[PDB]
């Protein structure tokens with residue numbers, strides 16, 4: 001007998017980017033200066049996701 | 051067995067072409083370079099922190 | 100005017116070269132990856148408002 005069966009394999013997912021200064025802070029300008037004291041956390045995060 | 055000379059010559063010519071294509075600075079070893087680069091950027095971030 | 104520069108100190112300790120990180124997109128791309136020579140490709144640099 002001849003039988004045709006199926007196999008389902010994932011290949012990829014959804015690509016995502018985030019803006020740190022809009023997620024953490026928003027439109028504020030005191031938050032931006034207070035967040036500058038933590039080094040490059042957001043350059044690091046943008047590299048990881050990219 | 052009847053075409054041994056042509057096969058030996060094709061083998062030798064392909065070996066010389068592998069050598070000449072590696073000499074001419076074409077980057078086909080970008081994966082080991084990527085390994086080196088990722089380790090160095092990790093340590094630069096840790097020291098800059 | 101208040102700008103950001105990336106200054107280059109040489110072996111003897113003197114400033115030999117600099118880029119202005121506000122002149123072009125290319126000077127910003129130079130300052131963000133911290134080099135003077137960039138390879139080919141696409142690179143994210145900053146965000147716009």
Ligand SMILES: *[C@@H]1O[C@H](CO)[C@@H](O)[C@H](O)[C@H]1NC(C)=O
Nearest residue numbers: 108109110111112113114115
């Ligand atoms: C550093 O100074 C010495 C003596 O002034 C000079 O001979 C040498 O070329 C200088 N190095 C560079 C990179 O200019």
